[PDB]
Amino acid sequence: EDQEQWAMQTLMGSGVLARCRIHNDVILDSGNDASSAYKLGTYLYQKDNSCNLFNTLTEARDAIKDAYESYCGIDDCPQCSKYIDD
Ligand SMILES: [Zn+2]
Question: Are the C-beta atoms of 29 and 71 separated by less than 8 Å?
Answer: yes
Which domains, ranges and CATH numbers included, belong to the chain?
1-86 (1.10.10.1920)
* Technique used by the depositors: NMR
Find the 57 Cα to ligand 1 centroid distance in Å.
31
Find the 36 Cα to ligand 1 centroid distance in Å.
25
Find the 52 Cα to ligand 1 centroid distance in Å.
42
Closest CA to 68 of 4, 22, 21: 4
Find the 12 Cα to ligand 1 centroid distance in Å.
16
The number of beta carbons lying within 10 Å of the beta carbon of residue 47 is: 8
